[PDB]
Amino acid sequence: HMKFTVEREHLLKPLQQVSGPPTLPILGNLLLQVADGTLSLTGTDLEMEMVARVALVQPHEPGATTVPARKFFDICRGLPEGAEIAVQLEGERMLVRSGRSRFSLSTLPAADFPNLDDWQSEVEFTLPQATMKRLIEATQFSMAHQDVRYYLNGMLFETEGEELRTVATDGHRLAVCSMPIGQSLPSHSVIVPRKGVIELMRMLNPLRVQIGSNNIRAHVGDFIFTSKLVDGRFPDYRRVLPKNPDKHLEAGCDLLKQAFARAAILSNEKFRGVRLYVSENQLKITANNPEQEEAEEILDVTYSGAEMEIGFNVSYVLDVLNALKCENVRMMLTDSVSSVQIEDAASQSAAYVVMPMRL
């Protein structure tokens, strides 16, 4: 039977990260395995799995079992600062002891725990965790949610030359972010599901990424996250990027954001439509709703192109301005019926393309 004794602080983050992700009963448990001075904790939902390794300095006995994830983490979290958690399997119940606190948890067999089927890595590289955080943070909001086009319910991860690129779209708006990682990579493109993007974001020391034909893996410290890839064809985002955006507007990121936020109050609650009128060094934003109420904002911008009018869903514009987090923004327009490319005025790493509304 299994047995181990460990500090509370050495078990918290390992349990918290593994318990992150109930349909069938064993998916609500964590598979615990003691072997050769190492405690391995494993959580899964069948699509993805998080493995954490904790080294055992005190005496232990090997074995394996599964225990309720949330209750075992809450027990360890609830124990005092600096507590020594003695764990041992007694028949069909795992016993957790610390001081004068005793907990008898129910178990399900370790043999019944589901494991992701083995696969072989095709692409492999390393990068800082902040670079991966920036890549996901910059495009996560543009992913679709419960879209019938299942391939849009996720983020495209693409390697080319010495850059790792993330792409996310829902058919109305698109987000791209490219970052150089300083390693020669092969040309590979995969769709990570939106649940896996959230877990990959939750665990960000270097980060090692291994990508296969149907799976992706991420190694952060003593944690190993694995997720199935979405088996579909992602749209050719290069075909969508504005080809010749002749009209260039430049304005303050915050002033433009606060104006769209104010105009949105009196926009249609269902369609969220705002009208942009660009003229020599000026932008007028107008919003109308079925109650015949109107919001109007006039801003000082930098614009020397021809005068034009264009409609937009104000939420999609605000999402891009909230994501950029910069001093100034660059809106690159074409005509009233074509998309707009929005970027930071000081950086080309992240670009956003929004399709307009016929208004």
Partner: peptide
């Protein structure tokens, strides 16, 4: 709302 493709 117009679609991207």
């Amino acid at each position: 709302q117009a679609x991207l493709f």
